Design a protein around this ligand. Structure first.
Ligand SMILES: CC(C)(O)c1coc(S(=O)(=O)NC(=O)Nc2c3c(cc4c2CCC4)CCC3)c1
Ligand SMILES: CC(C)(O)c1coc(S(=O)(=O)NC(=O)Nc2c3c(cc4c2CCC4)CCC3)c1
Ligand SMILES: CC(C)(O)c1coc(S(=O)(=O)NC(=O)Nc2c3c(cc4c2CCC4)CCC3)c1
Ligand SMILES: Nc1ncnc2c1ncn2[C@@H]1O[C@H](COP(=O)(O)OP(=O)(O)O)[C@@H](O)[C@H]1O
Ligand SMILES: Nc1ncnc2c1ncn2[C@@H]1O[C@H](COP(=O)(O)OP(=O)(O)O)[C@@H](O)[C@H]1O
Ligand SMILES: Nc1ncnc2c1ncn2[C@@H]1O[C@H](COP(=O)(O)OP(=O)(O)O)[C@@H](O)[C@H]1O
Lengths: 363, 103, 128, 103
């Protein structure tokens, strides 16, 4: 009963020659954002099976070495060894002494996929690092501000897959791109594109759509999970001469007593601002106002802050979504280039009845 | 996986015993006859418990429907309770199959 | 000037151990220039200086093996080795190899047939 | 494996001592003579403790039966208690063998 190094050596002894060569490449070339360290080519190539297991533990420690072995097994299509290592990770845990009262924890619950997953995050120091603290909080917070009055108590039940004919380039493919990859361009085309705009008549529901679009992705919900953050901002509160910074604008969404904005200032183009209603903007607004803004934290004028944000000169990679009234387009269209115009339409004949299916309680 | 398993198993297991005659069931097993209709247009293959759902070589991998024909009072109601009781502890039954639903 | 392998082996000896590790990594990761095939990781790491020079010649040929070394020396920043490789251009004759049955990439390959006898008669005049 | 081991060992160990003459047994060992009948149709191989069950080169790997012949009062009853007491602590005895059953 020694295992670990010996358990790993046993799987490695099951690799065919071709499999071993590839397993070793992967070790030597291990992808660099796991909290894992690749292994040197000399020692790796030279190592027999038991020595390779020892080398993996010496370089990365037990738990990471095991994770690396599992990933590589999948990668070289040895799914047998992938499933065997996955089922025999806390399998020596069953053959472990109770030691009477648990000094910290019994540790019996490690086979559970959620618990194994927790252990995988736990010792990551990179996946564990602060990723977890940044995620769950933001998600649940953005989620609980749109329900539970004691009519706005159910929203997804009131969905409809509202029409989304996205303006084909104004000088035939369908590509409705309603939710999945709506921001994404066609083949290449424009990878760093960030601006999308929705055109709909007054009262269509473009204000409703943003609340729904938030509510969808505010649980992951197979939405753009490859995108990290979304920022809802309706311009009812936003006004002129406010002289408030983006952080003040940001903290408006979630008033954190300890604003982590220094960590929100991370990975541009990984964060999306959902601006809502240009019509809501009340007051004068020069689309080409003289003074220019580039400072993120400076207390700047409300329209000026938007001016930089709309021009994206501040936060050059930040994505933007702007529900706009068609009549007010010429102001922003002259202001900003390459806008992903999206025409949104109301319910059809049958859909109108289907709305009453959502609404009414009796035939 | 652990939370999905142990619970379902013990639950499906404790609804068929411990009155204070239905207190022992596996003791009342018998390996009841199981001649599975050969295709209606010789191999034995009783397939009583192991791979009873499984076809022959390939044949039909995604097959899902099996039906038992027996006279009224044979014990087909009893068999399901036994077949549940068998696999409700793994018991070297189709452990390569995850869940069973008695109705 | 009979063997380029020996000259390549001497240059491998000149390489520092860190430079040799970089040289092995570069040989394994060699880019596709002049139809040159990169050495497999296991062979490069296990081979000593003499063996690696032989393996470089066996993999592509003496001329390509020397050319790969000159590029690798520049890549590993071994300027003295890179200058020496540019300074010395060995003759492409060949070193001693235990290829009694000749082998070529084509399926037909080569044999110990009449070709050998003809080559021997052509190169062997006085001894016999 | 751990739950099966320690328990069995200490248990088989504490039933042969500590009265308040049978209080020391290994001290009363002696390496008693063990001439194992050569096949009844010269090698020494006393095989007193190590590989006493083990055959010669191959010969009979799955052999299981060994029998001790001794006069009445020799100590064959004592030997089993000692042989248990030896291996009941591993004691570089047949640790490649898992369990022993005294009866
Ligand atoms: C094409 C053009 C210029 O006429 C146009 C495009 O969008 C607008 S708008 O003014 O901003 N939005 C609306 O008018 N919405 C609306 C409509 C009707 C009735 C009602 C509403 C709102 C509640 C009642 C009839 C059709 C449009 C105008
Ligand atoms: C072949 C055909 C059509 O006759 C047939 C096939 O299955 C049935 S059935 O009606 O549904 N089941 C029974 O009849 N079971 C039964 C039988 C006997 C006695 C008793 C019972 C139940 C308790 C007493 C004698 C043989 C059958 C009919
Ligand atoms: C060879 C044959 C047939 O005579 C034989 C082989 O073993 C036995 S036996 O009967 O079962 N065992 C004994 O007799 N033990 C014994 C002996 C002596 C004295 C005493 C004892 C027991 C205490 C006193 C003298 C020699 C033997 C008989
Ligand atoms: N998808 C939808 N399902 C049901 N009702 C909707 C939907 N979209 C909009 N509405 C209706 O529109 C009203 C709000 O419209 P709003 O979002 O303000 O349109 P706009 O933003 O174009 O003015 C709500 O009363 C709601 O009943
Ligand atoms: N394998 C069996 N062993 C003992 N008794 C059985 C067995 N199968 C059925 N029985 C008897 O049959 C009765 C229930 O039969 P049931 O399952 O209702 O048959 P069916 O479902 O064909 O009507 C029970 O009283 C039981 O005693
Ligand atoms: N190895 C030994 N050392 C000391 N005394 C022994 C030994 N073997 C047997 N005896 C003595 O023999 C007696 C028990 O003999 P027993 O094992 O019953 O022989 P058998 O089993 O042949 O009848 C004890 O009183 C003990 O003193």
């Amino acid at each position: 009963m020694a295992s670990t190094r010996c358990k790993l050596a046993r799987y490695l002894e099951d690799l065919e020659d071709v499999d071993l060569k590839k397993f070793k490449m992967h070790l030597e070339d291990y992808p660099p954002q796991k909290g894992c360290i690749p292994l040197p080519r000399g020692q790796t190539e030279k190592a027999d099976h038991v020595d390779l297991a020892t080398l993996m533990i010496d370089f990365n420690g037990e738990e990471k070495a095991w994770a690396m072995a599992v990933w590589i097994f999948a990668a070289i299509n040895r799914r047998d060894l992938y499933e065997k290592a996955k089922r025999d990770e806390p399998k020596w845990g069953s053959d472990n002494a109770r030691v009477s009262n648990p000094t910290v924890i019994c540790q019996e619950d490690s086979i559970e996929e959620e618990w194994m997953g927790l252990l995988e995050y736990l010792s990551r120091i990179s996946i564990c690092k602060m990723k977890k603290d940044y995620r769950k909080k933001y998600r649940k917070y953005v989620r609980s501000r749109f329900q539970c009055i004691e009519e706005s108590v159910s929203l997804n039940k009131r969905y409809t897959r509202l029409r989304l004919i996205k303006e084909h380039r104004s000088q035939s493919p369908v590509s409705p791109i309603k939710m999945e990859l709506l921001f994404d361009p066609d083949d290449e085309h424009s990878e760093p594109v960030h601006t999308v705009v929705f055109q709909g008549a007054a009262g269509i529901g473009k204000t409703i759509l943003a609340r729904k679009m938030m509510l969808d992705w505010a649980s992951g919900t197979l939405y753009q999970d490859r995108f990290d953050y979304l920022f809802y901002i309706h311009c009812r509160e936003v006004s002129l001469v406010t002289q408030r910074s983006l952080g003040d604008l940001i903290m408006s969404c979630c008033p954190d007593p300890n604003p982590p904005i220094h960590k929100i200032v991370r990975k541009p183009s990984r964060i999306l601002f959902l601006m809502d209603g240009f019509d809501e903007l009340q007051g004068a607004f020069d689309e080409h106002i003289g003074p220019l803004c580039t400072d993120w934290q400076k207390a700047e004028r409300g329209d000026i802050l938007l001016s930089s944000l709309i021009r994206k000169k501040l936060l050059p990679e930040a994505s933007l979504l702007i529900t706009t009234r068609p009549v007010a387009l010429e102001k922003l269209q002259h202001l900003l280039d390459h806008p992903r115009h999206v025409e949104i339409l109301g319910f059809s004949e049958a859909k109108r009845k289907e709305y009453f299916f959502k609404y009414f309680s009796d035939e």
